[PDB]
Symmetry: D2
Subunit: 114 residues, 4 copies
């Protein structure tokens, strides 16, 4: 199945934060309604934050996360969880190799903000 | 029900990251096996990161998040989600007032690292 | 926080299924747009299905689960999870006593159908 | 990523329930520590329950769900959600055709029981 794609409510501010846990340098691409709006590039084997930004979901609400290492697309896993029918988390893990820890880049999307 | 309490595998490193979205200064206490190991204090209405640390779950694996604003306990909501039977997110939201956005402090715990 | 309340897309068919794990007879009330549309009454200490029905979320999309045992409201826990940005689960546990297993009535809501 | 594989606590009773939403007849295979312990076969386009059993997780706690239609493996999506650090749901969807609704067989695993 496709992973890393989420439908947010329209015109909503959201946070996106990425962490790295790999020998490989991670590139996280964030798209909103099919346009790249953020890029995080970094490397850590100890969960360093490689980016955190506030974005708007726009008219369409479509948010897509892609992860690559040296140009190779990482395999993604994702889900959305809603707490108290209002607090949302869109969650991504990614795997750049074959150990299947799925933490090589970890991406957390959160809304609402403010 | 009690919220903000999670059982991690023993002696395992985990990331804890807190975000703020409130007029109130947030205090996030992180306890491992019933002892405070970290406290994050900060203020933001724009999802600023008020703390991010790597911690160890210790022998018992018990991790508890408590949130307060000027000595008043916030109401917590939480859940744990596991992707691909391997990547874990323990998620906390909190409410310090009456609008019920539950984002006033948001805490994300992730494991494994590395 | 309020638990057991979920916002579904309007005019959408959904499944609701309840399981019992308690000495006490469970009465699960399902409200759609603030009107009772199903009542499941049963008893089991071994996960018997006490109801499974197809319902419609109607104009407003509001679904609420309440559980009582001998007329006393059980404490609820809940969350929603979405897989592949499409497959939805709204999940409820309930506690009728002091052992905090939260499984005394378990309620699973799933959509879409068909 | 591999989907439909879950680690339960050892030697633990759990519920497994399968629902169908497809023109295709669903065959759901349940394995405990790499051996089949149940098979559910049925058809519905209205969320009928095609199986519900109580099973034991065995010494290793490994539970796997596989779904096929007329011998063809369905694509799976899955996650586990834990409420109140106690109440567990392991969730599977599956897709047998081209519409990507992932509901064609839906499997819910719940524990603890009792
Ligand atoms: C080469 O493998 C990459 O780096 C290692 C240090 C591990 O983090 C592994 O999960 C990652 O996929
Ligand atoms: C006074 O209320 C607090 O501050 C506001 C600016 C909002 O973030 C609200 O959610 C928060 O509870
Ligand atoms: C009296 O307590 C009720 O029945 C027992 C058999 C247990 O299922 C317990 O969780 C439940 O709350
Ligand atoms: C042929 O397609 C199968 O049957 C249809 C009635 C739908 O349920 C579709 O999701 C399913 O994959
Ligand atoms: Ca890896
Ligand atoms: Ca890694
Ligand atoms: Ca608030
Ligand atoms: Ca707020
Ligand atoms: Ca109980
Ligand atoms: Ca019980
Ligand atoms: Ca389908
Ligand atoms: Ca279908």
């Amino acid at each position: 199945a496709t992973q890393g794609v989420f439908t947010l409510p329209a015109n909503t501010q959201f946070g996106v934060t990425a962490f790295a846990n790999s020998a490989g340098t991670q590139t996280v691409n964030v798209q909103v309604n099919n346009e790249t709006v953020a890029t995080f590039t970094g490397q850590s084997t100890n969960n360093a934050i490689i980016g955190s930004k506030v974005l708007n979901s726009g008219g369409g609400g479509k948010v897509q996360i892609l992860v690559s290492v040296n140009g190779r697309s990482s395999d993604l896993v994702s889900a959305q969880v809603i707490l108290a029918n209002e607090l949302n988390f869109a969650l991504v893990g990614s795997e750049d190799s074959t150990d299947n820890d799925y933490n090589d880049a970890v991406v957390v999307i959160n809304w609402p903000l403010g």
